[PDB]
């Protein structure tokens, strides 16, 4: 057995796991698997001129193409100023995380490529449509706007009108749909075909478990989600120049992305973190829900009240987090992490390195999962520890076998020694788990640590 905080850290460092197992009766597909289904047709753009970016030029159509005509898609009109605005910013979050630009101008000679926006009229076409990069229609998309559907005449982040386009430039750059696919989510290849891990789902979150809305729409990801940003940095490359510095994410906001901003109690986030280097933070100390959050690239967090609305893109390392006033799980990764719990009694979890954790105010409860979190060359250090407040848990590395408080090791299994250096209030707990006779733990303390603060 073990205790309940040890229980929840990792019950939710486990709880959005893909691969090997069935998710509605589907195949569970991992990041990179749900990368190859987004990619399958092989189709891409190719660097023609070997600057080493996809560089691409597009036109909003201020008139019918040629060959449009014959094509029943009903009346031709071109883009408002505010579809080309949230268009450049659709267009902008596919650049900042794989190596393409885009410039406004029509087709020239050095472009490796040419993409246009307009609307049509006739509802026989869908919501919007788009072409792959190896179609003889390659660079276009196209918007429905009509009587009966004016979702696309006000696009706006975290509405669909800006997830469609996210989503058609998606199509363009080479990206399918999870699935082959009247058709629905029971149609899907795998579980984690929905707009909870791809721009490129139409199926509701809800599927997948997520809580986005009360009603399982419409609030949506502006910009590409965790296994959009893997299929499409497979294709181009990563963008690594981007947010390469030290970059905070939500509150506080320096991502300077509509959707990477919080600035109200109430607001909706849905987004998946692309930074290409630097010491960044989560912060989420604006509100005031019970948040759970995962600092491990590739993993999902529960953050503002919503549940599996965050998410960290593979391959990158962001170091610390901030929860809010309610009671948190924040989990670290293998790095030196901050973690910040704030108000409200929070659950801690450094993993590997030396992190340093604040508890904040309330009950907080520091949780270690193997020896290796916090060792003699490599210690945590509590940085607001409240001896009788809060709680060390050792319990996921003991098993509730307990420990067996000495003075020194005596070569005994269990044995630990807790100590107060007066002299710098620096409190320290060594364990020897194994019993060897030398620490193989330590987490060092600001202010005392008592043997009553140890569960174990
Ligand atoms: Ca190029
Ligand atoms: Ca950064
Ligand atoms: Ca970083
Ligand atoms: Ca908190
Ligand atoms: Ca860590
Ligand atoms: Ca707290
Ligand atoms: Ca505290
Ligand atoms: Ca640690």
């Known amino acids: 057995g073990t205790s309940s905080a040890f229980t929840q850290v990792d019950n939710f460092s486990h709880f959005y796991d893909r691969g090997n197992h069935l998710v509605n009766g589907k195949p569970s597909f991992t990041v990179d698997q749900a990368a190859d289904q987004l990619t399958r047709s092989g189709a891409s753009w190719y660097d023609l001129n070997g600057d080493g970016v996809i560089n691409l030029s597009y036109t909003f159509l201020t008139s019918p193409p040629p060959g449009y005509a014959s094509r029943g898609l009903g009346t031709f009109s071109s883009f408002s100023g505010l579809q080309k605005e949230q268009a450049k910013l659709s267009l902008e979050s596919w650049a900042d995380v794989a190596k393409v630009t885009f410039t406004e101008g029509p087709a020239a000679r050095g472009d490796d490529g040419h993409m246009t926006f307009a609307n049509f009229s006739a509802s026989n076409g869908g919501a919007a449509f788009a072409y792959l990069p190896n179609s003889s229609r390659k660079g276009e998309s196209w918007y429905l706007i009509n009587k009966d559907y004016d979702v696309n005449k006000t696009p706006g982040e975290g509405n669909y009108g800006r997830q469609t386009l996210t989503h058609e430039i998606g199509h363009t750059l080479g990206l ?154 924040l989990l670290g990764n293998a790095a030196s992490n901050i973690l910040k719990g704030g108000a409200g009694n929070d659950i801690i979890y450094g993993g590997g390195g030396a992190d340093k954790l604040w508890g904040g105010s ?91 603060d140890i569960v174990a």
């Open 176 to 329: 399918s749909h999870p699935g082959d696919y009247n058709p629905s989510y029971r149609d899907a290849v795998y579980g984690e075909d929905t707009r909870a891990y791809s721009v490129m789902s139409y199926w509701s979150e809800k599927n997948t478990g997520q809580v986005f809305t009360k009603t399982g729409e419409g609030a949506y990801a502006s910009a590409p989600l965790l296994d959009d940003i893997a299929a499409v940095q497979k294709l181009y490359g990563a963008n690594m120049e981007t947010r390469a510095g030290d970059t905070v994410y939500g509150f506080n906001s320096t991502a300077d992305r509509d959707y990477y901003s919080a600035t109200s109690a109430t607001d909706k986030l849905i987004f998946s973190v692309w930074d290409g280097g630097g010491n960044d933070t989560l912060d989420f100390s604006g509100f005031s829900q019970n948040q759970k959050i995962n600092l491990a690239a590739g993993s999902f967090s529960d953050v503002g009240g919503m549940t599996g609305n965050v998410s960290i893109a593979q391959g990158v390392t962001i170091e610390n987090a901030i929860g809010g006033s309610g009671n948190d799980l």
């Open 362 to 452: 309330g009950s907080d409860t520091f949780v270690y999962r193997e020896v290796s979190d916090s060792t003699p060359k490599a210690a945590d250090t509590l940085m607001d520890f409240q001896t009788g407040l809060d709680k060390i848990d050792l319990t996921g590395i003991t098993h509730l076998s307990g420990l067996n408080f000495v003075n020194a090791f005596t070569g005994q299994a269990g044995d630990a020694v807790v100590s107060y250096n007066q002299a710098s209030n620096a409190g320290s707990l060594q364990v020897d788990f194994s019993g060897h006779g030398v620490a193989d733990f330590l987490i060092t303390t600001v202010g005392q640590v008592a043997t009553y």
